From a paper:
GluA3, a subtype strongly associated with disease, functions as both a fast-transmitting Ca2+-permeable AMPAR at sensory synapses, and as a Ca2+-impermeable receptor at cortical synapses. Here we present cryo-electron microscopy structures of the Ca2+-permeable GluA3 homomer, which substantially diverges from other AMPARs. The GluA3 extracellular domain tiers (N-terminal domain (NTD) and ligand-binding domain (LBD)) are closely coupled throughout gating states, creating interfaces that impact signalling and contain human disease-associated mutations. Central to this architecture is a stacking interaction between two arginine residues (Arg163) in the NTD dimer interface, trapping a unique NTD dimer conformation that enables close contacts with the LBD.
AMPAR activation is initiated by agonist associating with the A/C LBD clamshells, which interface with the NTD in the resting-state GluA3. To assess this gating transition in GluA3-G, we captured the receptor in an open state (in the presence of l-glutamate and the desensitization blocker cyclothiazide ) and monitored the conformational changes using standard 3D classification procedures. Overall, we observed greater heterogeneity of both the NTD and LBD tiers compared with the apo state, with fewer classes exhibiting NTDs interfacing with the LBD (20% versus 45%). More frequent detachment of the NTD and LBD was also apparent through analysis with DynaMight. We further processed particles using a well-resolved NTD dimer (resulting from docking to the LBD), and these displayed clear features of activated AMPARs: closed LBD clamshells and a dilated gate that matches gate dimensions of other AMPAR subtypes. Critically, the NTD–LBD interface of active GluA3-G closely resembled that of the apo-state receptor (root mean squared deviation (r.m.s.d.), 0.27 Å), as did the flat NTD dimer organization with stacked Arg163 side chains and putative chloride ligand. The inter-tier coupling therefore occurs in both resting-state and active GluA3.
Numbering used by the authors:
A (entry chain C): 2 to 304, 309 to 381, 394 to 410, 423 to 496, 737 to 756
B (entry chain B): 2 to 304, 309 to 381
Amino acid sequence: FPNTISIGGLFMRNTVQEHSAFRFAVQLYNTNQNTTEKPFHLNYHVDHLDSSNSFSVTNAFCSQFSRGVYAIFGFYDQMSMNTLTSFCGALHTSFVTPSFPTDADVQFVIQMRPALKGAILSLLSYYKWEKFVYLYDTERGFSVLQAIMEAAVQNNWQVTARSVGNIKDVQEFRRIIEEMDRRQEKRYLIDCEVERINTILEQVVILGKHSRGYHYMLANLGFTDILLERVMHGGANITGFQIVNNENPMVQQFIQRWVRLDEREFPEAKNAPLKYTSALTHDAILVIAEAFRYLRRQRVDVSAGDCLANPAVPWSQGIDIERALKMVQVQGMTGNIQFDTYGRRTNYTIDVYEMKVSGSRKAGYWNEYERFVPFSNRTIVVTTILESPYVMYYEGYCVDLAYEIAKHVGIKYKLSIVGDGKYGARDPETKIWNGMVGELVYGRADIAVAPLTITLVREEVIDFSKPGVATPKGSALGTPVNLAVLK
Amino acid sequence: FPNTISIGGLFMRNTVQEHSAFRFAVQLYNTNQNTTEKPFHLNYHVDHLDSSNSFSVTNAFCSQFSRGVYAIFGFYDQMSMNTLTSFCGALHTSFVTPSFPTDADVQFVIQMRPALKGAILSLLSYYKWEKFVYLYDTERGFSVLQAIMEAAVQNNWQVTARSVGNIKDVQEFRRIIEEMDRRQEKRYLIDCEVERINTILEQVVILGKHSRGYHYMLANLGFTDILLERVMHGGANITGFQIVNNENPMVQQFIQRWVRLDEREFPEAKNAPLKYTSALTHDAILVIAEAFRYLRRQRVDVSAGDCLANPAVPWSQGIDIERALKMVQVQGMTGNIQFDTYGRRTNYTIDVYEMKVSGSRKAGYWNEYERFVPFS
């Protein structure tokens, strides 16, 4: 068995705290005095790669491979995931990563990040969500999206799915929020990156939808990195998922020893909140150390060419190292760590937090076997037209009719005069309705108590009561308004 | 100058007819008896990619690079474009591709699928499309989506965009169509693949939303590969784009010599409709031949290691080959062929077809300088 074991490290951009955690964990493993805990020295060959250039990624991976490594700890993005995964699976080199788990079943990859699909489904079942929105981007895989769609089909849910990964203008976010609010959707499920979640939440705050009655389920293990002070001040319900529990004594020790690090040699240390990815990196170091100690104990011989060989010769010892890595049983900052045959984590203990007015609170926890266990009248827009004797400065015949109708039906109504001041007609060129007909067809109003003449063209886009009151087609107010008009 | 020019071929899955067209065009160039037309013998080395294992793609590209190739004709998709483009740019190896043009500006890649942004925008402005649906997928890049959104912001349109790339259940298509119909959306822009376009058209036919009052603009070259008879009987307006003019004498001669080929030697050539990708492959052979003939004429010397050498030193003659490939002005099956500094088509004409009940009719043509010119 070698006296010193070297591993490769692959870090992307915007990844500085994780690098510090990696180096600090290696230093901690080396510094251990007990020979049993540290039977061999550990070395790293950290390198930085740009996922936007596959050539550079291949060169970095091949430098790591040629220099001689036993395992590679690295990050991959949706762009560079394929290259690293395929090369690692082809050359028989285990790849420990804390990034998003791969959708497909691939060997020689150990993913430190637990999957959120089961927890999300369990929370949706617990909260009894039968109809909601799902704003998603495909930067962490399609597993969650496919699971949500399959569950909705099976359970006959009403999920409004929207891909927000390609949106670069916040006005589109505002339009989406307004359109979905007009449909009376109180429940959102945001499965996006931290910055995208922040943008969506801030657009919500400006739109003023953070009041009571709104529930936001942030499907991201970045609850600490999400800015929601405004939203908690609003009073809306927020549900989040986390894996690093501050009450764990190991986490407390790691944090207390992590703060005293100088910001020069360990940048970002003791400056910003500890990202969960850093905990995953520390746990990855622990997993590698335990696996290699197990390999040494069992007296397994371990001991490099080029990536591009037509007769690709895999390591005879690669399978042994992969098996040793995947059979590990350790306790780390993220709890129990166990991997199945495909390198995915098992025995999750995801902490489910329910944000309260005072602050964040632990709602409960989710495990693979115990499932989830807890720790415990809108104003209706009435579009009208300014025309005597129907509407005057409001008072008039139509105002009285609207008051009577809103009395016969149980509703609260707010009048609004159409900005363009037109009754309505289809433009022959652009096929765009205007006036109150346009307001009703496009959902900007719920009812039009105005002298709208009943016509064949209009009857095909909206529903008229008896001699008439107009409503958008398919609305729930059609029959009540008709009956009120009768009486 | 070498007496024999060798090129590489990288053909992904479902690329049989393009392979046959590649071989046939190379044979046609070689069989020419004119001394000036064929000053060298053209050889090709064909490999088939998997496109789903980056290791396989890199292995194939490195085999091609090592065996010795002056140019590489190939295909790529969104899941293998980055690898081939990066390797070709780094090693100064020209990559002639009929695939979708890259969103970003990259070097050492000659793309000859004309961009549809200008034609689509011109048609939208000409038809007064100030409110329409936009069903798109990202299998050919985000260029069209970005152009449409910028145009909507600038012109105050009311585009309703929907990414149908990740939809695998037709019920989602039906729900989307029903929702847009409840909002009185009569005009659609479907920038999707041929299979997804066919699925969407099947859904609209099932829902009956193909009457005389609906207009569908299929923003995808390959108008002949889309099943439109069912929607044709409905009477809805359908607009499509093409780059191969069937009445072109060169296309006529190629078809005449192309339908009388052995089905064993040239599979898919007979009893199948020519794809625009095959025409682009033939035009790519024309471009390569013209570029190397020009290089020979100017007495430019052109004449290889491994992919991953640190530092990777590009070979000095790659600049000259790329420059000679990008300065060609040749008339092929897809009309005029010229390239700008970034290896994209210029001075290209896109035929706009409005399909009627009687049959498809060439409504007009679009050019960069002269915009949409209807025939009336």
